[PDB]
Design a protein around this ligand. Structure first.
Ligand SMILES: CC1=C(C[C@@H](C)O)c2[nH]c3ccccc3c2C(=O)C1=O
Ligand SMILES: CC1=C(C[C@@H](C)O)c2[nH]c3ccccc3c2C(=O)C1=O
Lengths: 326, 317
């Protein structure tokens, strides 16, 4: 964009090879993150290379894990291939990527290592996130909350608490409010995608939550999208929504514990996910009874103008991003 | 107004067929990534057909383009989808295929020629540049214009001229896409501007690879870019009246699509082609205010069509 050179210059990212990897990672985020990419313009320009690269990493691994053209075994192999490339770059054994996928892997890895080391994040623990995705690929149900927490801690919350530091907290409360907020987002995703995930063979609601309402997995498979849900399924849906609400409410202060330059982004992201609640609930949970055809809370202009002012003011008040890793 | 209610309006009552349409519509929602967002402007009774057709084009495009698979594996997988389709024309693979067959037969389209579209993607897999317009035309004809002239029929033309206006318009959209996504296609190793157009200005692929997105472009590259833009704009101006040759229910869809693509030209040219000098920051297929308003006007125009007495195409059976 008209400000990409401004962004890399403000961050002090001047090596020509490193700049190219940041740009490649940002373009990959544009392509895969799509609407999420526009959130970059709620961030301070000097912060955007790191915001882009971190989101790019999470979105890209998601995309490998979700690619409908690959079997689960081929997805697991692609995750292994990315992890191998990442670790080699992280350890300085760097290989020489040949294929397009290998080149993409390596460019993201090089920018990511630099981003994580810039922010004193545990760059050598990235494989734990990847392992969590690889495990999720062959995990089709969760017996109880403890089992679901394994997925949430490794796939959802590990990267969340890392980007939380890039948001530059101003109070010690931030990590815990981060965990509640992103948990709520992730639980919202499970509820919203219930039909699709069930069609993929995956139940992200804990089996003992179904048991509490006398329901089996087969009950859910038959009813979601069927035209009819039972009273017991309505109460289970309401149960899971209430869990999401409580996490959203327990994390509501998160934006106020973040640097002013990250606050509008997360205020806007919270509002966007908040809009999922009435869409799933209204018209006696019509969302779950039929495949509905509508433009949802996503598929942001006002926020960007407010952010542009907030970012200019931050700079004039002496905001200075920390220097890039050498 | 749910997918179930749209299938009801279309008269599609077979339970297995309905489930196949629902699957094709869910797939389109999943993978579409903002392509064909005008789907929301179509008359609800026709959405099962449009969603199945778009799902088909998106799915094959994405499979051919997925660099998580080798080119050789993508050719095999394209070939396998081809053979499965034809076999059915006589698991999500079979659902899409059954819905596609039914959509195509409902509209008197040559449903047995679907493999020519798949096979054109198969051939482009191993093609990384085109010597001239003639070689590029071979690619346009099977991958781009073959499905365009089929969905044209589903738009219910009111004049034989629709097919030619369709060809002009979609050719302009496709050419525009090559220019707009030049940086990404180059990164993926694909040059969609014919080699002899480069030569006209003394340029090689290395020049484009070096300059696009670098902060600098040469006068020769400016000229090549304007040359390709002029070709696309010529097609856009020739095909622009296409909606006036379509049933009124299809007009806001294509009027808005034409207008959105027409918006791309000044974005690419303004400020001395700044578009080509830095990395792209545009996200395609988003629900901007313009589009939302169009969907609102289309809702009212589709209700007017029904009040005027719009007979729904009888589904194939
Ligand atoms: C930073 C961030 C994060 C943290 C991420 C970059 O690691 C996030 N994780 C999610 C899991 C499911 C649904 C939404 C999210 C999100 C966000 O929306 C978000 O802004
Ligand atoms: C019907 C249709 C079509 C016809 C397609 C459904 O066969 C189309 N082909 C394209 C190639 C490159 C960029 C845009 C298009 C489009 C459209 O935008 C469109 O509406």
């Amino acid at each position: 964009g008209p400000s990409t050179v401004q962004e890399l210059d403000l961050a002090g990212i001047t090596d020509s090879g490193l700049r190219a990897d940041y740009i490649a990672s940002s373009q990959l985020f544009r392509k895969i993150g799509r609407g999420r990419f526009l959130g970059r313009y709620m961030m301070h320009p000097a912060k955007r290379p790191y915001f882009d690269t971190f989101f790019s990493f999470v979105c890209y691994i998601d995309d490998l894990a979700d690619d409908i053209n690959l079997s689960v075994d081929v997805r697991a192999r692609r995750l292994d291939e990315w992890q191998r490339t990442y670790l080699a770059i992280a350890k300085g054994e760097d290989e020489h990527p040949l294929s397009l996928s290998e080149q993409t892997d390596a460019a993201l890895a090089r920018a990511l290592v630099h981003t994580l080391r810039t922010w004193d994040l545990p760059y050598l623990r990235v494989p734990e996130f990847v392992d969590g995705h690889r495990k999720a690929l062959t995990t089709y149900e969760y017996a109880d909350q403890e089992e679901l927490d394994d997925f949430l801690e490794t796939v959802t919350l590990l990267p969340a608490i890392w980007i939380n530091q890039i948001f530059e907290p101003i109070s010690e409360d931030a990590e815990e409010l981060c965990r509640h907020t992103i948990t709520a987002f992730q639980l919202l995703d499970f509820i919203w995608d219930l039909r699709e995930d069930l069609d993929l063979g995956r139940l992200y609601l804990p089996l003992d939550h179904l048991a509490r309402f006398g329901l089996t997995r087969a009950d859910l498979d038959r009813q979601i999208g069927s035209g009819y849900i039972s009273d017991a399924l309505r109460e289970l849906i309401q149960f899971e929504i209430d869990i999401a609400r409580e996490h959203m409410n327990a994390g509501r202060s998160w934006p106020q514990t973040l640097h002013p330059t990250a606050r509008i982004f997360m205020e806007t992201d919270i509002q966007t996910h908040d809009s999922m609640f009435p869409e799933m609930i209204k018209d006696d949970y019509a969302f779950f009874k039929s495949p509905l055809d509508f433009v949802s809370g996503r598929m942001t202009a006002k926020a960007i103008a407010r952010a542009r002012k907030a970012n200019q003011q931050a700079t004039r008040a002496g905001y200075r991003i920390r220097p890039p890793y050498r």
